[PDB]
JSON list of C-alpha atoms in Angstrom, two decimals:
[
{"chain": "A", "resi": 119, "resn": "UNK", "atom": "CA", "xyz": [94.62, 67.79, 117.14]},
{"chain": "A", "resi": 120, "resn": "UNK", "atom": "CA", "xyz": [96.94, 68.15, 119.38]},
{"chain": "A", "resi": 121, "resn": "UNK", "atom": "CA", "xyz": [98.85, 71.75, 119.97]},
{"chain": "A", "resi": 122, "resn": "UNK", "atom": "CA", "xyz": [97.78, 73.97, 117.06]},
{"chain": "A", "resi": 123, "resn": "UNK", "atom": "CA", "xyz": [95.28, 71.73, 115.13]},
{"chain": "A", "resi": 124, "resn": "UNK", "atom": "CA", "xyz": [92.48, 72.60, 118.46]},
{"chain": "A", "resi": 125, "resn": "UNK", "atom": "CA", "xyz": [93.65, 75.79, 118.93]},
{"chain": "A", "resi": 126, "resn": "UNK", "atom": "CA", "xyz": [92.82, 76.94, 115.04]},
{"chain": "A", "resi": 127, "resn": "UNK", "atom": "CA", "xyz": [89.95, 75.47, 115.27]},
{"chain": "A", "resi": 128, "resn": "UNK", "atom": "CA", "xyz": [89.26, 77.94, 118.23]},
{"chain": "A", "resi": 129, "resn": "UNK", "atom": "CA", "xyz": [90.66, 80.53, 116.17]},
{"chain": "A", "resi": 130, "resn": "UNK", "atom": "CA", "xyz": [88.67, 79.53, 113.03]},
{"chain": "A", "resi": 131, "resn": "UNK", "atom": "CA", "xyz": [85.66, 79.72, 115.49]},
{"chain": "A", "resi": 132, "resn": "UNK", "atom": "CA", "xyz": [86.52, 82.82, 117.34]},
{"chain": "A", "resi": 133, "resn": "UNK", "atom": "CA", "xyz": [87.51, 84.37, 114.08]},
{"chain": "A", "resi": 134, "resn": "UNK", "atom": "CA", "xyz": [83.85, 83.07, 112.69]},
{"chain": "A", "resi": 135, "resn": "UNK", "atom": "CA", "xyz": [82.17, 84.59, 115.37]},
{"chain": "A", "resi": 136, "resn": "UNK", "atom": "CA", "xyz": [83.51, 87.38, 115.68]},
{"chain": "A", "resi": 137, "resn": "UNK", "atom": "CA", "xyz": [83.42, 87.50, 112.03]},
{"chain": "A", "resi": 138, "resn": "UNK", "atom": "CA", "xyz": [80.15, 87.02, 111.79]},
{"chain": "A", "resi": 139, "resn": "UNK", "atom": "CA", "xyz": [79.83, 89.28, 115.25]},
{"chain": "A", "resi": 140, "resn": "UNK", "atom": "CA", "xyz": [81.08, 92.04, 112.38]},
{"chain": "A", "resi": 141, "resn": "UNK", "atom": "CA", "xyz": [78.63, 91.67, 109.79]},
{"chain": "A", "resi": 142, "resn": "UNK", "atom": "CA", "xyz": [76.49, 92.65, 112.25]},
{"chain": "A", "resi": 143, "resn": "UNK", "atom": "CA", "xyz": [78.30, 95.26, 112.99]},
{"chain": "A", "resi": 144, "resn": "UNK", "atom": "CA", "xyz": [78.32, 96.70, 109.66]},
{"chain": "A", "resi": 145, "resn": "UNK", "atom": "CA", "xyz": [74.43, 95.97, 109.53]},
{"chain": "A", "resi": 146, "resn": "UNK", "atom": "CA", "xyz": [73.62, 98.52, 111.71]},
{"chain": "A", "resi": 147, "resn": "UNK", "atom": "CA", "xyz": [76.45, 101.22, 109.82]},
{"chain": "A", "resi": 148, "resn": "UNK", "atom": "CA", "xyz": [73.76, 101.13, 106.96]},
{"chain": "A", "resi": 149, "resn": "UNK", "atom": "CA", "xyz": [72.55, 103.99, 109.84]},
{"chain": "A", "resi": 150, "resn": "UNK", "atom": "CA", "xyz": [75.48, 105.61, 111.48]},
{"chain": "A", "resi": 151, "resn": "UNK", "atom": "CA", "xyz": [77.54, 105.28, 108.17]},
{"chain": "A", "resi": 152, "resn": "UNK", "atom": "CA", "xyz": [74.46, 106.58, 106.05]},
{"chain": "A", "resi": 153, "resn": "UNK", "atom": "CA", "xyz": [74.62, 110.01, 108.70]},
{"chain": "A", "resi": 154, "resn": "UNK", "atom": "CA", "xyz": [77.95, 110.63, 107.06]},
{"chain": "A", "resi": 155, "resn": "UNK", "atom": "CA", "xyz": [78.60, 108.65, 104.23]},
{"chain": "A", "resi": 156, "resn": "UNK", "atom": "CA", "xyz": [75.25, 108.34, 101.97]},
{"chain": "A", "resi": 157, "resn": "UNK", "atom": "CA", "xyz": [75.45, 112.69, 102.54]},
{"chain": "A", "resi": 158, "resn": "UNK", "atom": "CA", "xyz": [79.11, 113.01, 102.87]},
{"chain": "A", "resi": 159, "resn": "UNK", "atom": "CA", "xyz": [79.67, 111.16, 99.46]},
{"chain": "A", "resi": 160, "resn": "UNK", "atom": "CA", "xyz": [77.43, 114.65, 98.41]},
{"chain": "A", "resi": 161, "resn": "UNK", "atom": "CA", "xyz": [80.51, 116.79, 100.78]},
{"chain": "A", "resi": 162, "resn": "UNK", "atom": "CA", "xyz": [83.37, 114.97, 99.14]},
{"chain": "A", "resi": 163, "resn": "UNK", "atom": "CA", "xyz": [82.04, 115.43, 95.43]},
{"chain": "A", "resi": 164, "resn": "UNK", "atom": "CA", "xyz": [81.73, 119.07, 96.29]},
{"chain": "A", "resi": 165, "resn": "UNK", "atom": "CA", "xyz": [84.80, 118.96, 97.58]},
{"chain": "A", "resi": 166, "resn": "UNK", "atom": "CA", "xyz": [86.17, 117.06, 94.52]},
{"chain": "A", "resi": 167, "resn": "UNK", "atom": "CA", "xyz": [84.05, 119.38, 91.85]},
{"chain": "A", "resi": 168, "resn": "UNK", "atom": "CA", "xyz": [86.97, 121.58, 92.02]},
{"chain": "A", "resi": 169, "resn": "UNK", "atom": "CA", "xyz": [88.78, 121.39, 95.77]},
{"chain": "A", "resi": 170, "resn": "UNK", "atom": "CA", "xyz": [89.88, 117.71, 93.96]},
{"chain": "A", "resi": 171, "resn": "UNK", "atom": "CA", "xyz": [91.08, 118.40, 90.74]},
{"chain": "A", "resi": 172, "resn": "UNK", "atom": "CA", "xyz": [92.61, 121.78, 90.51]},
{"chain": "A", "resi": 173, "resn": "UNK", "atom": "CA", "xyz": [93.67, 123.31, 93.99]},
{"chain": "A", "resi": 174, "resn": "UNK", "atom": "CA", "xyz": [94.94, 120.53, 95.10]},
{"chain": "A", "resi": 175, "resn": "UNK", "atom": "CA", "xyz": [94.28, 117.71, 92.54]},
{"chain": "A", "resi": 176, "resn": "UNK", "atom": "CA", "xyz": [94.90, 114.92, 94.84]},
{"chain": "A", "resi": 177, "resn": "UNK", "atom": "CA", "xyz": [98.56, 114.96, 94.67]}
]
């Protein structure tokens, strides 16, 4: 444990918190993500009911 065998174990840690510090992160989204994703997925089909499959038919 001596040189990188510590030191990825900090990483492993660090990269567990902050890993876990972003599952959190996306707990709250369920809210700021729902403002434009649970009613934009409503946009983007309207925009897809036609604006994504004939004017410009994703490609």
């Amino acid at each position: 444990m001596s040189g990188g065998g510590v030191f990825t174990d900090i990483l492993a840690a660090a990269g567990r918190i902050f890993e876990v510090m972003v599952e959190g992160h996306w707990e709250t989204v369920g809210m700021l993500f729902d403002s434009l994703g649970k009613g934009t997925m409503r946009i983007n089909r309207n925009a897809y009911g036609s604006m994504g499959g004939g004017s410009l038919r994703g490609s």
